[PDB]
Design a protein around this ligand. Structure first.
Ligand SMILES: [Cl-]
Length: 261
């Protein structure tokens, strides 16, 4: 409705920044869109595509998820909540995927990127799925710079919603791999103040957050409302000042506006 549009515009203005939203409602195959064709820095939300690329590779390499990866001091980057506990040992690719998706561990992301061949290989996987908007240019930590006007490491809300629908509810991945991705996302620990904070307590959410420079604050989610068909929701937000603080409340507010009713 035009009312949902006016409410999102008012939220954006009060926030001082730039807000991007795409909701897909699978009940009626409808969309609610706000700046949904503009580019936004993905930050952490790009870990979904890296983990999905590893899952796809595993469809023709059984025991790929059990392959061991060495963790060294030289691997540490700027946010390593899980990897810092495993220095000088190994972690499996399954453990790295869970750490990336559920804790936003940046060493884990870098190991998923490296395994599949680098940022251009993650990007080529996106293209294979039919996503011609996503671009992963850099590794962690530099992919989080989020400089206004910079197209590196960006996508649009419309494209990321359509791709997340394919990955979690569609047929991009085999049944075992799709179920594993959904299980990992439902176990996320970083999203309770973002999209989830704008939805009723009874609804079930699998999500991946991101944050970066310029106060960039992001979340992408698959949502099972009580007794309703699933939803896909992307909320991306960025601000004008390099050192702006995070605004997870803006993502919660956007989620409430687009799901009310
Ligand atoms: Cl500043």
């Amino acid at each position: 409705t035009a009312d949902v549009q006016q409410k999102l515009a008012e939220l954006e203005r009060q926030s001082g920044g730039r807000l991007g939203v795409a909701l897909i409602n699978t009940a009626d195959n409808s969309q609610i869109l706000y700046r949904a064709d503009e580019r936004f820095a993905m930050c952490x939300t790009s870990k979904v595509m890296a983990a999905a690329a590893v899952l796809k590779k595993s469809e023709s390499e059984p025991n790929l998820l059990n392959q061991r990866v060495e963790i060294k001091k030289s691997d540490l980057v700027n946010y390593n909540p899980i990897a810092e506990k495993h220095v000088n040992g190994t972690m499996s690719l399954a453990e790295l995927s869970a750490a990336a998706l559920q804790y936003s561990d940046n060493v884990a992301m870098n190991k998923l990127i490296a395994h599949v061949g680098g940022p251009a290989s993650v990007t080529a996987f996106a293209r294979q799925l039919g996503d011609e908007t996503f671009r992963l240019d850099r590794t962690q930590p530099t992919l989080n710079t989020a400089i206004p006007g910079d197209p590196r490491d960006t996508t649009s809300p419309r494209a990321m919603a359509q791709t997340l629908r394919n990955l979690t509810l569609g047929k991009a991945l085999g049944d075992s791999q799709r179920a594993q991705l959904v299980t990992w996302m439902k176990g996320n620990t970083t999203g309770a103040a973002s999209i989830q904070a704008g939805l009723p307590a009874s609804w079930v959410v699998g999500d991946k957050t991101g944050s970066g420079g310029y106060g960039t604050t992001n979340d992408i989610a698959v949502i099972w409302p009580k007794d309703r068909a699933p939803l896909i929701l992307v909320t991306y937000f960025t601000q004008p000042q390099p050192k702006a603080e995070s605004r997870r409340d803006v993502l919660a507010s956007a989620a409430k506006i687009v799901t009310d009713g």
